[PDB]
Amino acid sequence: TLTRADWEQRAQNLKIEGRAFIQGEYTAAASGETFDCISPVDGRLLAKVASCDAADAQRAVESARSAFDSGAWSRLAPAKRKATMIRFAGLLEQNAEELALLETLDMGKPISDSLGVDIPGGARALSWSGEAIDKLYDEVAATPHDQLGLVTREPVGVVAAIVPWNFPLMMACWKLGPALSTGNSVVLKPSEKSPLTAIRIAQLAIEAGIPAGVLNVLPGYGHTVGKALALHMDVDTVVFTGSTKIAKQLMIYAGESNMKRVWLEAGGKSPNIVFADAPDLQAAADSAASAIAFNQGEVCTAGSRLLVERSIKDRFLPMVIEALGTWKPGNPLDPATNVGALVDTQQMNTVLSYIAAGHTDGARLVAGGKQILQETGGTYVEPTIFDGVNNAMRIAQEEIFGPVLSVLTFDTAEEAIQIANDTPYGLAAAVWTANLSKAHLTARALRAGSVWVNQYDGGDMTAPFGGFKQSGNGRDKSLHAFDKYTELKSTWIKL
Amino acid sequence: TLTRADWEQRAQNLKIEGRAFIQGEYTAAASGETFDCISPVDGRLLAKVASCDAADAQRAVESARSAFDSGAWSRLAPAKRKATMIRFAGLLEQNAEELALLETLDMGKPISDSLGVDIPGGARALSWSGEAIDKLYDEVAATPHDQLGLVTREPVGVVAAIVPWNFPLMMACWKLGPALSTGNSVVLKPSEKSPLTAIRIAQLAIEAGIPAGVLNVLPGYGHTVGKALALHMDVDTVVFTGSTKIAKQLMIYAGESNMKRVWLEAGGKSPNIVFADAPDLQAAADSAASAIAFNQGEVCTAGSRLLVERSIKDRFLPMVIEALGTWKPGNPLDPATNVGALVDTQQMNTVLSYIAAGHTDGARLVAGGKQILQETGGTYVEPTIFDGVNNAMRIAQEEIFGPVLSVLTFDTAEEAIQIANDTPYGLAAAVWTANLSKAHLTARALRAGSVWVNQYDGGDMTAPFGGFKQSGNGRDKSLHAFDKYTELKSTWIKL
Amino acid sequence: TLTRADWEQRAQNLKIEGRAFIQGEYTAAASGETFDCISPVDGRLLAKVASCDAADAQRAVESARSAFDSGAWSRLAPAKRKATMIRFAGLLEQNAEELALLETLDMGKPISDSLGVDIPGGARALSWSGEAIDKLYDEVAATPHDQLGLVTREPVGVVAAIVPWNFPLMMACWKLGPALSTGNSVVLKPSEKSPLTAIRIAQLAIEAGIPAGVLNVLPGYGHTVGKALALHMDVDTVVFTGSTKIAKQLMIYAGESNMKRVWLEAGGKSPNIVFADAPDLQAAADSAASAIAFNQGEVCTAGSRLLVERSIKDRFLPMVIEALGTWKPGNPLDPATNVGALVDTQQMNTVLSYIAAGHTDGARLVAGGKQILQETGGTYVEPTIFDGVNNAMRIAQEEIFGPVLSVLTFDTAEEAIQIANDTPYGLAAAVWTANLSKAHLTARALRAGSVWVNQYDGGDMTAPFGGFKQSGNGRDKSLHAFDKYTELKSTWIKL
Amino acid sequence: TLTRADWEQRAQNLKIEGRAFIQGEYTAAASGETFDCISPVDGRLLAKVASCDAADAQRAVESARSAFDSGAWSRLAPAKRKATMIRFAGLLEQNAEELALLETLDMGKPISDSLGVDIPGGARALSWSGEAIDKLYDEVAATPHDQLGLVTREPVGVVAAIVPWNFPLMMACWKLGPALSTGNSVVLKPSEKSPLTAIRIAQLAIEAGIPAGVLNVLPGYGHTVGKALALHMDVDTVVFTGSTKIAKQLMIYAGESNMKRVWLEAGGKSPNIVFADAPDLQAAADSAASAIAFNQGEVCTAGSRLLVERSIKDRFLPMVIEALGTWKPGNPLDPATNVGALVDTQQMNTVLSYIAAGHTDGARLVAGGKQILQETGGTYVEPTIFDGVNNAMRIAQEEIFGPVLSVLTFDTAEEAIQIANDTPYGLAAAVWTANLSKAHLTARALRAGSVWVNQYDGGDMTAPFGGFKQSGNGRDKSLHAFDKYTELKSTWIKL
Ligand SMILES: NC(=O)c1ccc[n+]([C@@H]2O[C@H](COP(=O)([O-])OP(=O)(O)OC[C@H]3O[C@@H](n4cnc5c(N)ncnc54)[C@H](O)[C@@H]3O)[C@@H](O)[C@H]2O)c1
Ligand SMILES: O=C(O)Cc1c[nH]c2ccccc12
């Protein structure tokens, strides 16, 4: 097991690829322009990364289209596509230490989380999806004797995947697994705040046996190459994970261009509801702190609204404060660190401004509240809790995307539900109770794509993930994710 | 069996309802404004129809939301929702002669078509969807022993349904069947060119046992109340059938407002491919004629591009011409009529303009081409055929929505396929051949939501219907239509 | 609502059909022999019923086979089979009062039960199964590009259905619904203790539109015509509901003859587990009473072993005793009667013998225990409860098929589970607790086809029903029942 | 690539395990008895193999039951069971040369077939089944709001698997893949004619991580240990592949014992129908010879009845004779050999007696017909063809299970179908035609579990495999195979 000194040495000894990847080769952007990739660990320069624009989008899509039409991947036998996807996952695992390190340096998450959660999470999405390919069956309708009615699925063609910076590799693999498994060509567009792991795995895909042109990667800004992909007249489908504001813009771009399918995973303000009869309050307290502090609270399913039944509030909140105290910001390259840096200065100032807004709107600070470790040249903030929060407060309505907890109380189940659903969002929610009826009925009443009962952040590759309402449309993970990347065809044959 | 004079007497003796329907009662628009509903049959005033606007959209959505939240329909037992939907369908059939007559007077299709195709088709959509409700099963995931993972579907809430004028009742039922069966409230927005049947069935829904508020109907213009529904912040989903131009605008509206789900059924330029080894050339000829002339060519899946293998072209085209000659425009109230009036003067002008464009671009007129029966005060055009059409010509690229057939030739299956897919559309296609491999391989290669083999206009309620590319997203009919009206939820329970 | 005197008048005025039914016509047995059908209500002669034997089995199977091969029903369009099955169900409901009366006179269950439970239950099985037919889809495999792999289901052909006397019409419909819906011909063999309703509905099937030969009915003894069907070389499948002893014999018959498929629904000794934290003890008490007394305890899933946590036993048992006191034997033709006659003298003797065995083995009689109403000429027994029962006792191990309840105690959930599964049977079980984990984990641990939580006798047509272990194989109701009446075919086509 | 000399050296250098395997250890039979395992290659003694009896069955089942109840495998997380099954498959491949060699020496098939078909076939069944585990979902019924209806699958418990000698390892894996993947304990009972690969892989299962007791292997005779497993009162399910005669006996044993579920894969007499319009007659001829000569015609789907349209018979039969001539018996340890030895003297004399019966009943010998290579001390027979066969002849009705072809003619499709279905069997069939309608309609009319079109022996792990009629019940391969090893449970929860 590697030490802090080992990781620091490894970080120094990396050679970091920064180019885009098109038709099987790394390449500069057509303009030759780059942007600086800066580490939030200490501010070091990782790489000059290709800054792609519309011209590069055009070339990547021409490459994607041509590869799709050749059938090299899109008409490869299901069992061979499975084998290739599983080897692709295997190469992520074989290169886990470098990939984990890139992620940590790129966007600041703890090396033990990169290594233990992100890389295996990414590989598992690729291999599970690959495993599923020949387990899927299409349909034959019940028809008259002189008819054969087939209902089958086909790949849409060229897929644009636009992804965010909080789980760069894993979110990429959530798209890539099903999109590639179904036979599509994909143009992947990583966040400008974390381009490095996407750039790196382009090569691994080739090594696994993914044909040239099937997976192209275009680093660069959202408002340049990202927008260009979303407006492209020969992209069939765009899948997106990011902010709600940009998600809406993609719908507009699709309407302005070619009516491409649009699938969105956006923000969240997930309610974590703890009833007095929770089976294990200590477990509920640990999970409540984890739900907001893990990955610096840069998690769209962060349990950012803690709803607690009033009769246990006085006992429970100290338990949460105590639990939160074990999550301490520190050097991300130290294996012992469990909370890392925020992704950048812009992100940190947003979080600090929301903390200020907590004070302004009348909430009570009971833990954290300040920036720390300024001397490192990195960006760190204490996990923070506000008590006495009303659901109309800004820190209650708006996604903060930092480790900032809002605590709300209720006295009836019906009120807990009303408060929990009082949001434009609907990504996730949790319910803690030992009562059979109350568990299922409350879960059923919550308008969220994921509802966790007596746990937080549950589910694995078998569990569809995505939003109600303005948290998005469609689902990642499970077999349901495949439907985003395919079209139904009814073939009706007269005999 | 009713005669022409019987239908004319019945037409005279109708009292026609023109009001909007909200919260279980017919009502004027808030503004008190109306528009004239004029028959294309002869020009008579059918009714002064409520002209709804944004205020009416607001009242109908508030009514829809409150109905949804009460659980009166959305939490009604599956078997009870089933029985109600089947009674709803039964009422359409019980009132078939009136509904068919309203349809024929409202938009000009022949009375024998309204009675024999539209009303039964609409009823079938309502009853089949109802029958299916308690035959559907959600999912339980394979999880560790201390987890229970449920994957269930829930109604989205408030659905706006915006539909066109070519099959007014049937297209509304395609939406209502699954949207209502899943428990949603629906605000239905019929075309301003054909509001009457939607207005009428609002009352039948109440009689069937659909609760007040669950089905509201808002006649009025697209750019007023239609746009208001698409922009409404408390509408969860909009489903649409209409032009590609407006479909795109709906995506824009959703992005501008609340990221509502958008499901689109749009235009088409469907290729009908006849190979030299078609098993029954006469059947192929009869079908080719019917595919362009049925419902005055005002059919989204009209076989408007006829692709013929060159070696049989000289024999096959005269057969198509003779078959088309049996399709003759006439009085829509005559039961013997198989081709009715176009919907309005604007539509006839569009069709005549495209006929002129056919001449212009260099095609050869071989049948029809003229307006007829002007003295009736109605709008009628001869079923028309252009020979020597190249796929680049305007009449081959652009949807005409009239009875105008373009005839193209090819020499290889590969060429046939290239021409078929050379279109922004992808709603339907057909292939005629006796050969096993050629049938399946050609069908597989065609980028269209429905592919019919050795028949045209096939499929029933078991066949999903909808577009590739700019012909839309999502499917109507079958069990797959239900997915447009529900959300997935993953409930992961720790035990 | 009909009174007792109304029902008695109607009973007097029935003309009762006693013949077999083959190839669309009622018929005598080949031998001309009959058996007396005697009512347990008072002892009157209902009819002289045809006593079929091997020759009749042969004629009915030849008729079934020829009907099957003609395609008149087996190749009838799915939507047409659906409509016919729904009309068939409609005729049962249209003739509900006669059918219910036949059932009550034939085997002694209360008229309000026959009318309120059996006839609607039977109709529901026929209509739900019919509704499902065109909602089912077969499969298309994920194959290489030059292969098309179809996985479809086909009717087995000729089905023999052998059913018991406790729910004569309902058990027949459980078989007929799915067997007929899938296109099979059926030879139905009702119990010699209750042949009348099966004989009657043969005619209703013809009226609904079921073709001649598709449903044949052969009244007669198990060891004659029953055995002949099970041994017949041209019967493809036998489905059975009855005793475990005979179920086993059927497997032997199939091995001795033609390896026909054998699907069995056999006996049970279902445990009803009441934990101290049941949410509603009164509901639990009412249900415990109903679970043993309903239909005279002649119910395969009768909750005949009541397992009670020792800490609530002293409070709960008197509640069960009081609840059981509302269940009182009486004249089956009185609509107020909730407990009817046992089916015959032989059955009453068996029940009395088990009551005596209860005393013998050392249990404590706390309610009932005696035959009553002897002066009526009918066979009636008091609903009975033994306390202090050990699971090794005869009344705890052996199915009694009378209203005799055994009460056992436990201290831990683990012990409850061990006792519940300590049986050769596995048809049903129930668990009563308010606790989430205990509910699901206990339910998961119980080896039984149906597990009911905080209710007894739950489920509807959506719930598969059938046994673990010696309680049978395969399931009735739901879509899973269809699989007993079809075969899978893999059609792999090279293109 | 290994030479004949290499394989002969390897064969000499094997140390061959002969013991049974129970609770994680190799063991003698309780009696200490053995039987000689003799190679049909040249007659050498491979090993003295444990001859188990009823006492060993008892001990293996006690071990199986105890392992199942411990939950070590039966309650292991789905994703971990998947991993273990995939490693199990991997160890088959890692030990492929030894396993292939054992199979070839044990029952005489060519080493290139053992290595190229059997071992990879076996591994693929284990890994595909393992891959499928967490891709399967159970069901949630549509129920009223106060109900939650779960329909789930659970492992049956202890499975006996009894397998034949023609594909010893592969047939074993067809059972083991799904049975183990679903969580059952399995007692595997290999043929006495080929025990060695089953004995050997018991150890590999342990190495892969299958817990002790989950997979026990009992070599020995059918009429001793095989019968004992089938009659055992604590075996829940027996799955069988073998002769039709013994398959029927298993049904009888189940009836005599505990009503255990019985799933059967038995014999076949598969029709290979070649129409005059077959797309590629040469391909049809090659496949027809392969269909009967591959694995010495010891294949239950052997195309043993060749049905040829009369108009091509004179051209086609010489093509078949010529093709068959390239299949030549030779030394099984020679990599060039494509037809090996028959399994033993008993089998060879059966085949020779059927060839004699071909002459007797009036058929015309047009190829092969004799035993050869007597000097080797092994058993070999020429691939043989009889012409002018009528379907009532013994060689037409009875499974021969040697390389003996019967040629029949027809002149209409309807006659081809009648002849093809004129059999007690229904395992497989094939159809060769270029015509779309004739292909699908003929395929639909054939009463066989597998129908191959324009190919023979098609399908992969996605295609269910098994019989109609006396060819068996249930299916191996695909997801459908899992249903043989699980029980449905309806858990109905009142909320
Ligand atoms: N599964 C999920 O739903 C999920 C997962 C992780 C994060 N999120 C959300 O993502 C957000 C993370 O912050 P963020 O800054 O990465 O979101 P963001 O919307 O600012 O950027 C996300 C991606 O979209 C690109 N983009 C930006 N503008 C674009 C434009 N006009 N056109 C096309 N592409 C454009 C960006 O370059 C980036 O790749 C959070 O709100 C979080 O809730 C959601
Ligand atoms: O979508 C339409 O244009 C209506 C439509 C498509 N297929 C049909 C078959 C019969 C009647 C109407 C339609």
UniProtKB/TrEMBL annotation, chains A, B, C, D:
Residues the entry annotates as binding NADH 2: 163, 189, 192, 242-243, 253, 347
Lineage of origin: Bacteria, Pseudomonadati, Pseudomonadota, Gammaproteobacteria, Pseudomonadales
InterPro entries: Ald_DH/histidinol_DH, Ald_DH_C, Ald_DH_CS_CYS, Ald_DH_CS_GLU, Ald_DH_N, Aldehyde_DH_dom
GO-annotated molecular function: aldehyde dehydrogenase [NAD(P)+] activity; nucleotide binding
Family statement drawn from the similarity comment of this UniProt entry: Belongs to the aldehyde dehydrogenase family.
Domain Aldehyde dehydrogenase: 28-490
Binding residues for NADH 1: 163, 165, 189, 192, 243, 347
Binding sites annotated in the UniProt record for NAD(+): 163, 165, 189, 192, 243, 253, 265, 399
Residues engaged in binding (indol-3-yl)acetate 2: 166, 301
Record protein name field: Aldehyde dehydrogenase family protein
Active-site feature positions: 265
Entry keywords, A to Z: Nucleotide-binding, Oxidoreductase
Oxidoreductase keyword on record: yes
Annotated binding of (indol-3-yl)acetate 1, by residue: 166-167, 300, 457
Keyword Nucleotide-binding annotated: yes
Organism for this UniProt entry: Pseudomonas syringae pv. tomato (strain ATCC BAA-871 / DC3000)
Pfam families for this protein: Aldedh
